[PDB]
Design a protein around this ligand. Structure first.
Ligand SMILES: */C1=C/C(=O)[C@@H](O)[C@@H](O)C/C=C/c2cc(OC)cc(O)c2C(=O)O[C@@H](C)C1
Length: 294
């Protein structure tokens, strides 16, 4: 895999757009176009920036944030600017929050599984993301196109074998994906009710706690979600299987290409009796499903 060699002088560093695992993300201008720059803040980040460089140099997929190139003085990654910001901000950010549909929710998850299945298909060795969560998922094309960034606060999406220090596989990303599917359908932060620190989430998840069940969730979606959540990573489906299932389910989710443009004030969490109400509405799914089946 190859990457551009860029002069920091060619970059017009604009405002800070966020902060990740290491470094800082700024909006910037490079070769008349808009970019996202992840600059180095401390000498300790060098090993991570280099590993991210060699990894992202071989990665080319529509659902993965494109790394245009890099600077080596100072060390900085020049990427495509995801104008729609993070999925976390769309779901849980500052008001006004956008309205979104069951079709957007399923589409975002399909697209995330498409990018992760590409990473897992990597030869000679599969690439594991290890930090799949809404802050690391970015949106473009009016909030309709999802792109994964920052390959590995995260305890709520972490597979129990990972924090157990156990030998884990690409099945840890499948667990995180299952949590994200619950999170987009409910528009709730997973394990928000469990007060911090992280060890309290880890203890609960390690003991079998999973997000509450969704009232009126279609049985095929419920089965997929809970299989992804399995304690035993060998019982979880592969990403290739999630892609196929999610692809087939989209026939009952039209409208995923509709940009996010509507204001939303639905933004009120009802209650918790072991079961939560979905934020999205499955009425149209059930209707479209009946036409095909009976
Ligand atoms: C991808 C994820 C990441 O580090 C997160 O911490 C993220 O939430 C920070 C924000 C990144 C960001 C934000 C915008 O618009 C607000 C646009 C972008 O292109 C990016 C971006 O590319 O972030 C990645 C470098 C990291």
């Amino acid at each position: 895999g190859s990457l551009h060699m860029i002069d920091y002088k060619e970059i017009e560093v604009e405002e800070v757009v966020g902060r990740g695992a290491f470094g800082v993300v700024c909006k910037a201008k490079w070769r008349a176009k808009d970019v996202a720059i992840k600059q180095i803040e401390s000498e300790s980040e060098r090993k991570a920036f280099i590993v991210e460089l060699r990894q992202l140099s071989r990665v080319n997929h529509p659902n993965i944030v494109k790394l245009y190139g890099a600077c080596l003085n100072p060390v900085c990654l020049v990427m495509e600017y995801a104008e729609g910001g993070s999925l976390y901000n769309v779901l849980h950010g500052a008001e006004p929050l956008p309205y979104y549909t069951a079709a957007h929710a399923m589409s975002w998850c399909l697209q995330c599984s498409q990018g992760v299945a590409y990473l897992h298909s990597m030869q000679p060795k599969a690439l594991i993301h290890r930090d799949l969560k809404p802050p690391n998922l970015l949106l473009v094309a009016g909030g309709t196109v999802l792109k994964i960034c920052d390959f590995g606060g995260s305890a709520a999406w972490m597979a129990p074998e990972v924090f157990e220090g156990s030998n884990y596989s690409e099945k840890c990303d499948v667990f995180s994906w299952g949590i994200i599917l619950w999170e987009v359908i409910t528009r709730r932060k997973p394990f928000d009710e469990i007060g911090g620190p992280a060890f309290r989430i880890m203890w609960a998840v390690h003991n079998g706690t999973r997000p509450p069940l969704i009232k009126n969730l279609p049985k095929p979606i419920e089965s997929l979600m809970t299989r992804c959540w399995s304690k035993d990573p060998s019982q979880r489906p592969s990403m290739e299987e999630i892609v196929k299932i999610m692809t087939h389910l989209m026939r009952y989710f039209p409208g995923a290409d509709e940009p996010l443009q509507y204001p939303c004030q639905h933004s009120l969490p009802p209650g918790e009796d072991g079961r939560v109400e979905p934020y999205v509405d499955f009425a149209e799914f059930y209707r479209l499903w009946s036409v095909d089946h009976g």
